[PDB]
Symmetry: D2
Subunit: 114 residues, 4 copies
């Protein structure tokens, strides 16, 4: 099943934050309406924030997260959770190797802001 793709309300600002837990350098791309809107890279085995940004979901609301390590696409897991019918999380884990911890890059998207 496709993972790392989310439909947000149109024209809405959202936060995106990435963490690293891996020997490999993680590259996280965030695409809005199929175009790159943010890119974070970094290396940590201690959950360091490797980037945070606020983006607008645009006319389509389509947001996609991709993760790669030295060009090799990571396998992704994802889901969206909504609390009290108001607060949205779109969550992504990724695996760059064999241990299947799926934390090598972790991406959190949250909305609404403000």
């Amino acid at each position: 099943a496709t993972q790392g793709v989310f439909t947000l309300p149109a024209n809405t600002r959202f936060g995106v934050t990435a963490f690293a837990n891996a020997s490999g350098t993680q590259t996280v791309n965030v695409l809005v309406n199929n175009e790159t809107a943010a890119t974070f890279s970094g290396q940590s085995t201690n959950n360091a924030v490797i980037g945070t940004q606020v983006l607008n979901s645009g006319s389509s609301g389509k947001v996609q997260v991709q993760v790669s390590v030295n060009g090799r696409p990571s396998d992704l897991v994802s889901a969206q959770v909504i609390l009290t019918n108001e607060l949205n999380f779109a969550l992504v884990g990724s695996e760059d190797g064999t241990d299947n911890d799926y934390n090598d890059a972790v991406v959190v998207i949250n909305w609404p802001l403000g």
Copy 2:
């Protein structure tokens, strides 16, 4: 129902990260085994990452999040999600006022690390 209380794996490192989306200055307290282990604070209406820290869940694994604004406790919502039976997120929203956006302080706990 009680919110913002999570049972983590014992003796295990986790990340805790807080975001602010409010006019009021937020204070987030993270308790491990009923003792304050981290405090974050800030003021942003644009998702500032007011704190992020790696903690150990200790012998009992009990982790609790509390949020206050100028000394008044905020109302909390929370849940835990698990992806691919391995990757864990404990999620907290909080409301300091009347609009019920529940994003005034947002806290994400993630494990495992490394």
Copy 3:
């Protein structure tokens, strides 16, 4: 925070199913646009399905679950989960007593159908 309230896409069919795990008879009311659209009741300590039905979310998409036992509303917990950006679950637990297992009536709403 309010619990058991969900915004579905407008005019969309959804499933609603309730289970019982308690000594007392559970009455589950499902409201669409703030009117009772279905009512289920039954008693089980073994997760019996006490009702299942297909409903339409109507013009507003507003769906609410309420649970009553022994003449009093139960305390509710809830969340919505979306898998692969397609499959939606709106989940409700409820507590009628003192043990805080929150399973006394469990309600599952799922969409889309077909």
Copy 4:
């Protein structure tokens, strides 16, 4: 990533419930410790409960859901969500074709019971 595999607490009763939304007849097999413990089959495009049963997670706590149509395995998605640190839902969707609604068989596992 692997989907449809959950680790439950050992020796614990849980509910498993399957729904169908597809032209193809769905077959759902629920494995406990790698042996089939329940099986449900049926065709519906209206969310029929093609089966619901109480099982015991046994010594291993390993529960796996498989879905097929006339022997052809469906693609699975899944996640687990925990409410108020107490109430567990393990969720499965499945896709037997090309439209990616992932609702062709939907399986919900809930615990604890009683």
